[PDB]
Amino acid sequence: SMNPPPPETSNPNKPKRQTNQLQYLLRVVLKTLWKHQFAWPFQQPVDAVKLNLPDYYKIIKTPMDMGTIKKRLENNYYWNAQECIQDFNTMFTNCYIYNKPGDDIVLMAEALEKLFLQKINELPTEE
Numbered sequence: 001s002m003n004p005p006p007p008e009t010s011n012p013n014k015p016k017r018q019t020n021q022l023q024y025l026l027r028v029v030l031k032t033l034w035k036h037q038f039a040w041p042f043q044q045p046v047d048a049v050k051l052n053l054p055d056y057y058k059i060i061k062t063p064m065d066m067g068t069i070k071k072r073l074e075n076n077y078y079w080n081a082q083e084c085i086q087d088f089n090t091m092f093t094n095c096y097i098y099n100k101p102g103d104d105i106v107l108m109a110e111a112l113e114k115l116f117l118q119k120i121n122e123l124p125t126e127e
């Protein structure tokens with residue numbers, strides 16, 4: 001089971017902009033999760049080949065990871081905060097869909113998601 005192309009991080013005809021909320025998503029939210037002890041499984045797309053997960057991309061049809069999110073934020077790929085928040089939620093949800101309750105990877109996602117929720121709670125008002 002081969003890996004798919006990763007999610008796009010560049011698309012010239014996609015409308016995009018910088019907002020103060022998107023800056024916060026990079027400087028606070030992504031930075032916080034990225035430095036966490038449990039970040040590493042989430043720092044790049046799932047390599048189904050090297051991880052011996054041949055069913056991964058038969059089950060997970062909307063893959064997402066923080067490597068992709070990081071690049072999207074660095075490239076100002078998003079139009080608004082909700083697009084980026086949705087990417088984080090997709091990443092967490094994928095983990096819970098694919099894996100079993102109590103698996104190490106799920107505990108790791110749960111810890112990252114708690115921090116995500118704490119930071120998004122203080123998302124600044126736009127502009």
Ligand SMILES: O=C1CCCN1c1cccc(NS(=O)(=O)c2ccc(F)c(Cl)c2)c1
Nearest residue numbers: 041042046051053094095098099104105108
């Ligand atoms: O579901 C996801 C999203 C991100 C990676 N991932 C996933 C699911 C199932 C196995 C693996 N393989 S692994 O990277 O070597 C691994 C990583 C952390 C762990 F705690 C354990 Cl027990 C194994 C990865």
